[PDB]
């Protein structure tokens, strides 16, 4: 009974209430005020239907008289004079700390629990017979033409089913009803408001489960396809479009522990013998419901089978059939559908065209999976993934890893597939590894799923799949476009096919494919290599006689594509085909297919011809090799086969963009144990981990060659000139390991990159004195790599060698690409920062103040104390600093030399050059010390009389004066305090440009 | 019905039931939850477990308590689930595919679920760790990376064994971290990891059992981390707040870094932070905008939550007795502090308002732990404070608006230190005085202000009568003295006071309550007339309603006969359409805690309101709006309305008076925006007799419930703000005499609408002045079935 | 204009896509217009608008898909430069002339970026005798197009579709009114097409000659060309 107990005065449902007088006097009183809303309803819609002020006034009484029972819920929430819980809780709970309250708030909160078990009493009941007197009152008015009137009326029938039971059917059985009616008494506003009112939240939801109503309504919002005037029939497609989008059922057993209900089980002996008998009638409404739905669904097919013509509404049957003919959890296969759902093809409708496919390919992947489950339609959900065809292998075999490896590269006598993405390995083995078996099975079905396919390789003719490939091209032009929902219907085709339905031979696809393959049409030859991906996807097909038809078929007609004639609309399709297909197929399913871009007649070496054509292959090549990254990575050849010594960009590039990828294949580290893996982490040098993809020597030595062969090559251009450059094998070479790098440092190789900067990488790029100039023609940014290179995945270990690179004692060998080294240093700190050793953070610091030194280049010393900033900001602790500052203003300080000296050294000396440029440095290095440092105004004036000079330093100390006094510039009302000396005077100078006089 | 009894037993856990009985309750849920097959509302089942195992219910955690009492729970069903979304061979059966919403939703809450079934997973099945890993990991290539790593990080259970421990399994993930560059799609899953299982370590070191098998792993320097693996993760903390942007919740990302402090051992590790608070210093500037605002705001203000988390969670285990070193000491509250000070400074004036609530919401977290730094932070805040009401920020709009929020979030605290709630009187009495007409912002952030030092003080006169009293002589002269000292670079350690001159200048402080709010009142009346709206006309009358339950009988009797003069004259209640709410709710609020106060009152509201129907008022017809000669009728009907809701049983003196105007309020005045007032006046008498609700609210009690005088920070603090005999609470409920005159009402009124409409029913279709009339008693009515709601009972057709 | 976009253009051109749908097909011996019109309600004066289908001149005319009152802007001033070229060279307009001579104010638009881009797609259809008969298109984005049979507004890519299948360059003029309605089975959300959701529009080789008739169907003309077939 009662449970949530909230002072109802009459008594807790005792019927100690019942015995009160003063409570058959209250309801004698609702009773009175309903059955006097109902005499002023019928007084009203029949003196006064032309007033909408009424209406809405009875419409709220009775939104009230149907909810305010227990509790209060119109009025519920207006702010009345009781301070609010929410409010009161943001402003006295801390978190992390229990009710840190005032007495004030566990009032509210208190009184907030007793309104609150209020509401719980859940109002919900049985309809009062009067009660149902005025919900239908309330339809009537729902269901009314003024815009003024159904709208509030539609938002307050829907408080009253909340509150009523069942009350949906009672909704209904008026509805449908009174919607009927309104159809044949024409055009109606009251179709228009019905309308309205299936699209309210809780009714259009109430309806997918409306199993026996639903039959009727569909085939009358079928009729109300006719705007015979006005919004309906598109308000009619919404609808019955939103109603395929629901429904369905679930026979599946639960695939549930049964422990899931057990730990609940009552002592009560077999009186459970109740749960197997609810599972029987919740198992013959079930079996009910889903024959109403194949009766809809003949009853439908003949409505369009036999309906000459309807037009174009031809749809909701179609977009339903099918989220029905393939549902499974039941689902009788029917044969009668499978014709008609083909024979709509005769419309020759774009639309409809595209659905047949998308249908025709459900509805067997349907049939199919009936097979491979063996009818258990349970073993879908079963993660003990069932198909005949799937076969598990144990990865642990001391012996495995070179299995795979070398039977990767098998293509002949294949032992297993991996269509999709194979994860095991790579990282390590030890797991188990689902995988597929060689020249898969069909299986059986029992004779009714055998009609089935039957009646669509009867209705698959040569002429069939010639109407339907043309419209796809043609509704395809506009777009580009691929869709493997296309490809994965030919696959289809081929089951039926060789496995006995079609007969149709493959070699119909054959010329249904070198068919619509123009040089010309665009969309015409996309369906050409949506054929092609079908024919490998046809291997979960059998005949290995066929297989040899179709391997024989493609190795001819990637000759006439690819093999020379080829436009950018070609490569844009192909291209595509690359990095799609070995993602949706093992490609050792063929022979030739692979053994064909990797058939390498394209990469020429110099230029006193046209050196000949294209990446012809390259990026083609690559889009495979980068989709499979792992398997099939056989390459002995490859590698003795690259280039480098193109005279094309083109080439160039590609050459290296493969390359990139090629590494990228042996790089993954697939060990042979886990343990034997965790290992190997365990003990590194980082109290971090293994490098994870590390470059296995074979390779770190091809590479080290191509560097080296570089540096040999260096008396190629023992003088020439920037005409004479682009045309040298040293060029040649150069580009091609440049444009590597780029695609290196660009994504998830980057760990593979490091290892060689140190001594090849930045050796290297700084091939930038070996001609500026030379950059500018064959436009590369070198100086932008090479300090891009200084944020980057680098390890506590590589970190040491490179601080030890720059910072080089061989330094002074470079020369204004000295402020090239100098910026990559200000990137890497800033990416090594707080994990640079206070060592490391010196040997930097004592180069760059090296820097603000160095006879020579003035370009450099101003860029060094830019730099010498950055490390200063990040140096708070108080005794390196002061030991700066002492430094810098000891070739300074005081008036050491009178006047006229200043102004000759300001120009010439470089210690003191440097001095002042460091000491500018650390004053730009605190930008916002909120309250000022007093070690800044008195070196600052140390500075001033230095800005007073006209003069090569005292210029760079003018800078650190204005720079100054700009960022000081909002905090400034109150930094002049701190300024005694009037050595604010001594700052005014400062900043001078030629509009300043 | 599966889905209707799971919400039926949610509402059970209101109340308790035996820990055998969760042990079972989990166990189906668990199951449940991992269904395959059908339709299943999820979202429900996973909630269900996820709340019968809270680790939380009321400082009581089920998750401890389900352990002890012999779950366990199968980890192949939930494994067997997550690896669906692996790349399943034979594309044409692959059923889920990250990326598509509907799958990856799926995912996340299998994920979620894992997080929550982990503890159950046998800790005595030694080889489940190492099995597990062993068979993910073969699992891990880039294809799988996006699905992988977020298993690990919830569905593998911390275990810690003689041989295989779980933090055996790090240095792989340093391996992938340190790989790739900072990238959110993977740093998330590695700082979770490392952080919710650094929490774990800690966690079990303390009270409970030091162990689950092994204390074989050892904390130190820089929690269960390496010195390089701690290098790490600060270089990339780094990297994120200055370059690369990359985290999501940051909750999540900071764990690692807070429980890896060691009490004993910090040191090497606070070096650490402060080079990573030298780093970050500058892009917190309020003029250094750019993609790193949020990430550097998110992740202080994370921080110092995950923080603040621990040490209050510590502070609750050394009231178990057990102090562990490895516990956080004064001593690193201040270095915190020092830390992050000028650091929160810098955000809260920030450009963005959002992004400064974050590092301003800092302030409340660095005073809960009390460190002795405690007055760095009172001295910025009160300064700042001071120089804003004295307009010295004028020319800077967010110096004024954000120093007003640094002392809101911080109002709680400053009336308990001693020494600063002196200035509490002072600045409050000013934040009054100042709220403006024109500025409707600046006013928000003031009642901010005023709401939050009425909501955490009594607003009594304290003084024993002891003569030298007075604000200034007193009050005023010290609070200056504090103010030029800390203004001069000094502190408030620094400041030395008498004991006695100090608790005269807070004593004789308390005085000022009547003078303020003769101005605050002031205020309200001004208010009446601007076009401020609803979120800010309400906030003011929980202002309103607060000040009024902190005062003692002698204030509030003040207050009282304050309302009462301003509210009759008035010149106030002109402009267009006023807000009536900021004037007659504060009177009803008077009745609930005075119901004498109403017997005089409301015949004062009906002979004013008789006074205005009688000379034309609502005699001009017009839906729509509402006529400006009827707004002082539509004043006092308002209060009305808003009063006699709040009169309970004292309406049962005048009630004949009433109910007879009533009727006579429906035979004259007929206008159809009049009568949704009107008819009003039904509901709020029949709400009031018989709806059960509370009375007294009181900061404290009856005036006299003596906690003594030393009684400001409401016990906000103390222990016994919560014995029964503080919160000794009044409560309406209604006597069998007032149902009785709520039942003479409702069918008084029930006839009286029910015949002048059967009367009408006599049709003039024209008149119009007829359905005005009808709508009028069909509201009547309707109010009349409302409020008088409370004696229906939905059952009653059943019997 | 980030990545070399048009934004305020691409903004207006799929508002295009949104009002309206329009059709042109050029016949070997005639030219054909055509439009759907917008969301109607019962007491709209259904004959009057005309108000997606204008004459520019005796021999010129356009189908709108866009904002009305911003292409009736345009409209009036191109029947302007008509006459124009008469009062000047005392010759009737030659068809690409005064497209060009819209496409240029639009374009007008698309770059003294200080005033706001034109709704409105149109197509022409026109005969001058220099190009035989004409069929034109004209986005807002400045650009215009030469056509055997187009389309455009809501629905577009579709009927692009049917168009582009059923048409034959031998086509007669009655051959292509039908082309016209079949292609508006499809491209109607209003399941089922009226006489007075529609606007129709011929230049033929004129009622007698060899010279250019041009005609605009009264209601009554069109629900009996639809009586050869889409409702009868």
């Known amino acids: ?276 008998a609810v599972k029987l009638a919740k198992k013959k409404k079930r079996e009910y419901y889903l024959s109403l739905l194949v ?200 089951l039926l096919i060789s496995s006995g339905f079609c007969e149709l031979n493959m070699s119909d696809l054959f010329e249904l494919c070198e068919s619509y393959y123009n040089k010309d049409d665009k969309a015409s030859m996309i369906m050409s290599v949506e054929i092609v991906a079908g024919l490998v996807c046809g291997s979960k097909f059998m005949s290995v006689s066929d297989l040899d038809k179709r391997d024989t078929f493609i190795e001819n007609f990637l000759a006439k594509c690819l093999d020379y004639e080829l436009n950018h609309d070609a490569f844009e399709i192909w291209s595509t085909l690359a990095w799609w297909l070995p993602a949706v197929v093992d490609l050792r399913r063929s022979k030739t297919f692979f053994c064909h871009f990797i058939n390498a007649d394209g990469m020429f070496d110099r230029e006193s011809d046209a050196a000949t054509h294209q990446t012809s292959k390259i990026y083609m090549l690559r889009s495979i090799l980068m989709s499979m990254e792992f398997r099939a990575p056989d390459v002995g050849k490859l590698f003795d086969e690259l280039v480098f010594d193109h005279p094309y960009d083109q080439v160039r590039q590609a050459v290296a963009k493969l390359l990139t990828t090629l590494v990228q294949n042996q790089s993954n580290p697939s060990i042979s144990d886990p343990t034997t893996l965790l290992e190997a982490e365990r003990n590194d040098p980082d109290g971090l981990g293994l490098p994870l993809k590390s ?117 002074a060998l470079s020369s204004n690409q000295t402020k090239l080294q100098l910026a990559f240093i200000q990137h890497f700190l800033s990416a090594e920062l707080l994990q640079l050793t206070e060592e490391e953070k010196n040997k930097i610091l004592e180069f760059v103040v090296s820097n603000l030194y160095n006879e020579q280049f003035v370009e450099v010393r101003v860029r060094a104390a830019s730099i010498l900033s950055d490390i200063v900001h990040n140096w708070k602790e108080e005794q390196p600093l002061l030991s700066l500052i002492e430094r810098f203003a000891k070739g300074l300080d005081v008036n050491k030399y009178t006047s006229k000296e200043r102004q000759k050294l300001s120009k010439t000396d470089i210690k003191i050059h440097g001095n002042v440029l460091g000491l500018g440095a650390i004053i730009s290095a605190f930008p916002y010390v909120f309250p000022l440092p007093p070690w800044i105004p008195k070196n600052l004036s140390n500075l001033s009389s230095w800005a007073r000079t006209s003069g090569m330093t005292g210029n760079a100390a003018k800078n650190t004066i204005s720079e100054f006094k700009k960022v000081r510039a909002d905090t400034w009302k109150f930094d002049r305090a701190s300024f005694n000396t009037e050595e604010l005077e001594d700052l005014e100078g400062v900043l001078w440009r030629s509009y300043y006089a | 019905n599966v889905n209707h009894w799971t919400n039926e037993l949610k509402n059970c856990l209101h109340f308790d039931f035996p820990v055998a009985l969760r042990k079972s309750l989990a166990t189906v849920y668990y199951y449940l939850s991992l269904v395959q097959g059908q339709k299943v509302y999820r979202q429900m089942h996973v909630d269900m477990f996820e709340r019968l195992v809270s680790l939380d219910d009321d400082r009581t955690q089920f998750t401890e308590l389900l352990q002890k009492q012999g779950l366990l729970l199968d980890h192949q069903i939930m494994l067997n689930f997550l690896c669906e979304f692996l790349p399943y061979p034979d594309p044409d059966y692959a059923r889920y595919e990250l990326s598509s919403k509907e799958d990856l939703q799926l995912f996340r809450l299998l994920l979620k679920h894992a997080h929550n079934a982990k503890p159950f997973f046998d800790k005595s099945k030694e080889s489940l760790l190492v099995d597990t890993m062993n068979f993910l990991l073969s699992s891990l290539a880039p294809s799988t990376m996006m699905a992988v790593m977020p298993i690990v990080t919830s569905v593998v259970p911390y275990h810690y064994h003689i041989h295989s421990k779980i933090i055996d ?33 800690h966690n079990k070191i303390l009270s409970s059992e030091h162990e689950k098998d092994v204390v074989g792993v050892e904390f130190g320097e820089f929690g269960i981390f390496t010195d390089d693996q701690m290098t790490f993760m600060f270089n990339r903390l780094q990297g994120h707040l200055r370059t690369d942007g990359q985290i999501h919740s940051y909750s999540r990302t900071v764990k690692p870094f807070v429980y890896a402090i060691n009490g004993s051992k910090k040191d090497r590790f606070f070096e650490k932070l402060v080079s990573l608070a030298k780093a970050i210093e500058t892009f917190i500037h309020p003029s250094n905008n750019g993609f790193w605002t949020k990430p550097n705001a998110k992740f202080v203000h994370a921080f110092i939550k995950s923080y603040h988390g621990r040490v209050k969670y510590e502070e609750d285990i050394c009231a178990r007795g057990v102090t562990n070193g490895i516990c956080l000491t004064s001593f690193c509250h201040e270095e915190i502090v020092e830390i992050f000070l000028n650091i929160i400074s810098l955000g809260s004036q920030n450009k963005n308002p959002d992004i400064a609530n974050y590092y301003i919401s800092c302030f409340a977290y660095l005073l809960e732990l009390d460190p002795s730094n405690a007055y760095l932070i009172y001295d910025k805040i009160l300064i700042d404070l001071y120089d804003t009401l004295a307009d010295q920020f004028i020319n800077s709009r967010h110096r004024i608006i954000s120093s007003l929020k640094q002392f809101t979030r911080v109002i709680r605290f400053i009336v308990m230190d001693k020494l600063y709630r002196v200035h509490i009187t002072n600045v409050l009495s000013m934040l009054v005085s100042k709220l403006d007409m024109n500025d409707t912002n600046l006013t928000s952030n003031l009642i901010n202000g005023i709401v939050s030092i009425a909501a955490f003080i009594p607003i009594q006169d304290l003084t024993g ?109 002109k402009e267009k359409d006023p807000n009536y709410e900021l004037v007659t709710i504060p009177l009803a609020a008077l009745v609930r805690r005075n119901n004498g106060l109403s017997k005089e009152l409301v015949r004062t509201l009906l002979f004013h309101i008789k006074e205005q129907i009688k000379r034309g008022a609502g005699s001009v017809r017009s839906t729509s709006e509402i006529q400006q000669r009827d707004v002082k009728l539509v004043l006092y ?116 609408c029910i015949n002048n409409v059967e009367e009408l029913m006599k049709a003039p279709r024209h008149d119009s002045e007829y359905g005005d009339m009808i709508q009028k008693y069909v509201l009547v009515m309707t109010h009349t079935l409302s409020g008088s709601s409370l004696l229906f009972d939905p059952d009653f057709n059943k019997y | 204009s980030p990545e070399g976009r048009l934004y305020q253009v691409e903004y207006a051109l799929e508002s295009i896509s ?32 005309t108000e997606k289908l204008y004459k520019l001149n005796d021999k010129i005319a356009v189908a709108v898909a866009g904002l009305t009152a911003d292409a009736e802007i345009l409209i009036n001033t191109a029947r302007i430069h008509a006459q124009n070229y008469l009062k000047t060279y005392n010759e009737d307009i030659p068809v690409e002339i005064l497209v060009r001579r819209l496409s240029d104010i639009k374009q007008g638009y698309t770059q003294h970026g200080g005033l706001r881009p034109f709704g409105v797609s149109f197509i022409y259809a026109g005969y001058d005798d220099r190009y035989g008969y004409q069929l034109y298109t004209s986005n807002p984005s400045g650009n215009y197009t030469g056509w055997k049979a187009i389309s455009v507004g809501a629905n577009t890519s579709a009927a692009q579709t049917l168009l582009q299948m059923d048409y034959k360059d031998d086509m007669k003029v009655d051959d292509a009114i039908e082309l016209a309605l079949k292609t508006l089975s499809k491209t109607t959300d209003s399941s089922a097409l009226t006489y007075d959701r529609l606007e129709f529009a011929t230049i033929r080789k004129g009622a007698n000659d060899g010279e250019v008739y041009q005609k605009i169907f009264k209601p009554q003309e069109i629900k009996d060309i639809l009586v050869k077939t889409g409702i009868t």
């Open chain 2, 637 to 752: 009907l308002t209060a009305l309305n808003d009063v006699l809701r709040n009169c309970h049983e004292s309406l049962l003196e005048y009630s004949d008076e009433l109910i007879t105007f009533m009727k006579y309020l429906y035979d004259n005045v007929t206008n159809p925006p009049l009568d949704v007032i009107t008819s009003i006046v039904i509901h709020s008498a029949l709400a009031t007799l018989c709806t059960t609700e509370i009375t007294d609210c009181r900061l404290f009690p009856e005036d006299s419930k003596i906690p003594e005088k030393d009684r400001w920070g409401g016990l906000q603090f103390d222990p016994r703000r919560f014995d029964k005999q503080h919160l000794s609470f009044q409560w309406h409920v209604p006597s069998s005499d007032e149902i009785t005159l709520s039942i003479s009402i409702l069918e008084s009124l029930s006839e009286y």
């Open chain 1, 695 to 811: 470059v296995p020597e074979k390779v770190d030595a091809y590479i080290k060659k191509q560097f080296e062969i570089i540096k040999n090559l260096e008396d190629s251009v023992v003088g020439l000139n920037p005409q004479q450059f682009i045309k040298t094998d040293y060029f040649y070479r150069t580009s091609t390991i440049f444009y590597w790098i780029k695609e290196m440092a660009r994504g998830p190789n980057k760990v593979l990159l490091v290892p060689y900067l140190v001594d090849y990488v930045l050796p290297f790029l700084i091939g930038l004195v070996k001609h500026k100039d030379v950059c500018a023609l064959a436009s590369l940014d070198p100086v932008r790599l090479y300090a891009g290179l200084g944020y980057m995945p680098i390890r506590k270990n590589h970190v040491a060698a490179i601080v030890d690179y720059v910072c080089s004692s061989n330094v």
């Open chain 2, 169 to 201: 399994y790090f240095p792989f993930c340093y391996s992938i971290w340190s790989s790739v560059s900072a990238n959110v799609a993977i740093d998330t899953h590695m700082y979770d990891f490392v952080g919710s299982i650094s929490k774990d370590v």
């Open chain 3, 18 to 49: 949104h009002a309206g749908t329009a059709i042109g097909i050029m016949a070997s011996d005639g030219i054909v217009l055509a439009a759907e019109r917008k969301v109607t309600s019962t007491l709209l004066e259904q004959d009057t608008s």
């Open chain 1, 1 to 276: 009974l009662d449970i949530y107990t909230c002072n109802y005065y009459f008594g807790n449902t005792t019927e100690e209430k019942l015995q009160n007088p003063n409570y058959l006097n209250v309801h004698r009183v609702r009773a009175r005020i309903g059955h006097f809303f109902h005499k002023l309803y019928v007084f009203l819609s029949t003196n006064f239907e032309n007033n909408t002020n009424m209406f809405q006034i009875l419409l709220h009484g009775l939104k009230v008289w149907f909810t305010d029972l227990g509790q209060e819920t119109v009025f519920n929430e207006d702010p009345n004079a009781f301070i609010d819980v929410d409010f009161l809780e943001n402003v006295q709970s801390l978190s992390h700390v229990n009710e840190p309250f005032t007495r004030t708030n566990f009032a509210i909160r208190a009184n907030s629990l007793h309104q609150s078990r209020v509401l719980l009493h859940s109002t919900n009941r049985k309809a009062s017979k009067l009660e149902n007197l005025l919900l239908v009152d309330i339809i009537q008015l729902a269901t009314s033409l003024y815009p003024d009137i159904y709208k509030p009326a539609q938002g307050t029938l829907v408080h009253c089913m909340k509150q009523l039971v069942g009350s949906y059917g009672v909704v209904i059985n008026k509805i449908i009803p009174s919607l009927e009616k309104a159809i044949k008494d024409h055009d109606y506003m009251k179709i228009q408001v019905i309308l309205n009112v299936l699209l309210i939240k809780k009714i259009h939801r109430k309806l997918m489960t409306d199993y026996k109503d639903i039959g009727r309504l569909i085939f009358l919002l079928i009729e109300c396809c006719r705007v015979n005037e006005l919004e309906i029939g598109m308000y009619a497609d919404k609808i019955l479009t939103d109603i395929v989008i629901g429904i369905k059922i679930p026979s599946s057993v639960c695939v549930i522990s049964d422990q899931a209900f057990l730990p609940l089980a009552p002592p009560d002996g077999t009186i459970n013998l109740q749960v197997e």
């Open chain 2, 465 to 573: 009568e002891d003569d030298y009293i007075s604000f200034e002589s007193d009050t005023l002269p010290l609070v200056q003295q504090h103010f030029y000292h800390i203004k001069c670079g000094e502190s408030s350690k620094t400041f030395r006071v008498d004991d006695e001159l100090l608790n005269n200048a807070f004593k004789a402080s308390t005085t000022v309550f009547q003078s303020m709010l003769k101005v605050y009142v002031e205020k309200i009346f001004q208010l009446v007339d601007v076009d401020l709206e609803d979120s800010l006309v309400t906030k003011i009358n929980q202002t309103t309603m607060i000040l009024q339950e902190s005062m003692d009988d002698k204030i509030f009797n003040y207050f009282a006969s304050l309302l009462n003069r301003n509210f009759w004259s008035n010149d106030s209640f």
């Open chain 1, 295 to 494: 009766d809809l669904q003949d009853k439908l097919l003949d409505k369009l089978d036999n309906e000459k013509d309807m037009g174009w509404k031809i749809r909701m049957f179609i977009l339903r059939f099918v989220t029905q003919i393939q549902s499974n959890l039941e689902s009788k296969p029917d044969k009668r559908a499978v014709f008609s759902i083909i024979s709509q093809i005769s419309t020759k409708h774009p639309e409809i065209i595209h659905l047949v496919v998308k249908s025709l390919l459900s509805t067997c992947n349907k049939i199919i999976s009936l097979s491979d489950y063996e009818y258990d339609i349970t073993r879908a959900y079963k993660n003990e993934f069932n198909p005949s065809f799937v076969e598990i292998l144990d990865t642990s075999t001391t012996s495995f890893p070179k299995t795979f490896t070398e039977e990767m590269n098998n293509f002949d006598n294949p032992k297993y597939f991996i269509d999709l993405r194979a994860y095991v390995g790579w990282l390590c083995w030890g797991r188990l590894m689902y995988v597929m078996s060689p020249k898969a099975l069909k299986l059986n079905l029992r004779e009714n799923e055998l009609e089935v396919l039957k009646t669509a390789g009867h209705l698959l003719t040569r002429e069939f799949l010639r109407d339907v490939t043309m419209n796809l091209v043609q509704d395809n032009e506009t777009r580009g476009v691929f869709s493997s929902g296309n490809v994965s219907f030919f696959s289809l085709v081929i």
